[PDB]
């Protein structure tokens, strides 16, 4: 290939963003396990509604952290020759959007009336 | 514990506040704990804590009904004031009537709490005092606090009271256009009386002030402006342009997807800043809407065309202020730029052409000029 030293700078930025995404994804993973735990658990019904609505603050914080990541990714300008960077950027945005769709699922299952 | 520090200058702004200190023969504008030279005039109430500044603005999307901002639009006003009634239709937080006085109503640690506007502003002032102390490594008590020239007695008193509640010894309340003229040493220029036009264009407010400086005395001759015109309106025009472009290119309407619009708005605001020092800005947003990548660009000329009526309209309050001050544009000795939106080259060009090529006072960071002049005043009164 014609791999340039300049692309290494963009790839490093994207790696830092991937690490930041992984930290937020671990918070989402704990929300999913607790949500599954309440839905399939042995709590009485009135306590179940309360336990589910207690996840609201954390799910909203998780959504916001993912949105901030997308805004930081959106500051990148990658020339068409920087193919690896573009593929990495595309993969990272799709991964964040799939995580946001899981956050939306959590929101659909809590604080319902 | 800490040694006693110097007196500071605080620009207590509608959306952002700024603190400066005069040290080693110059003004240092103080960065907050996040490295920002301006601090959002935001206060948030959560199930567990009270957040001020950047930490409050950062969680506004997560807790909108308990995140207070714009307390300056309420401070010293009666509940039935036309401004209070008009503004409360747009705020996500509640404003209640307490015996004719407005109060912000919020949920705080699971309890319904109400606060007067001066209590909210006292919390922003407490943060500005702490920002100064974190930088200086000394306790800060003395401060000059600024207010708009059009603030009446009640609005001035309520600002002084916010300073008192914040534990500040308010050395003086001075007008924002006066502070900007002080920052440029306009009072120290030799000769007769000087007529000064202050052109203050922020993110959400436009204020024109005409001052006369005679023998070191500042007299406000007139005030004009547009209370809700600012940088945000220019961002709106750019967003509308790009939503229309996505419809033409992809036959898809992104406008009901809040996250796609927010991503686009954030990129627009950033591209607009780029356009003040470059003639073109590029935007690349992967998977903006229904998996479609949005790769585009905007020239400075296109940005100017999209906002032509708004930029041109900034001269109408200038003419109104001149009319009210009973002065001809040729009698203006100094023009001062305040507010981040004054960085727009077309705005500078229109104002300079109106004043027949006269140079503008713009070397001081327009977001910091008011705090700068306040810090100069604070040092003089020390
Ligand atoms: N370089 C700039 N060009 C144009 N507008 C700016 C610039 N810097 C700050 N602003 C705007 O000033 C306002 C107050 O921060 C915001 O609307 C912001 O976008």
Numbering used by the authors:
A (entry chain B): 149 to 261
B (entry chain A): 0 to 381
Give me lines lifted from the publication on this model.
HSP70s consist of a conserved N-terminal nucleotide binding domain (NBD) with ATPase activity, a substrate binding domain (SBD), and a poorly conserved C-terminal domain which terminates with an EEVD tetratricopeptide repeat interaction motif123. The two main cytosolic HSP70s are the ubiquitously expressed HSC70 (HSPA8), and the stress-induced HSP72 (HSPA1A)3.
The difference in affinity between 3 and 2, between adenine and adenosine, and between 8-aminoadenine and 8-aminoadenosine illustrates the importance of the ribose group in nucleotide binding. Structurally, this can be rationalised because the ribose 2′- and 3′-hydroxyls form an extensive interaction network with ATP-binding site residues. In addition, we found an intriguing difference between the HSC70-NBD conformations of the adenine/adenosine, 8-aminoadenine/8-aminoadenosine and triciribine fragment/triciribine structural pairs. By contrast, in the structures of the ribose-linked ligands, this loop is in a more open conformation in which the carbonyl groups of Gly201 and Gly202 interact with the α-helix at the back of the ATP-binding site. This conformation is similar to the one observed in the ATP-bound HSC70-NBD/BAG1 structure, in which it is required to provide space for the phosphate groups of the bound ATP molecule. Intriguingly, in all HSC70-NBD/BAG1 structures with ligands containing a ribose moiety that we solved as part of our fragment-based campaign, the phosphate-binding loop 2 adopts a regular β-hairpin conformation interacting with α-helix α6 and is compatible with phosphate binding as observed in the ATP-bound open HSC70-NBD/BAG1 structure. However, in structural terms addition of the carbocycle group does not completely mimic adenosine as Arg272 adopts an extended conformation in the adenosine-bound structure, but is found in the ‘up’-conformation in the 23-bound structure.
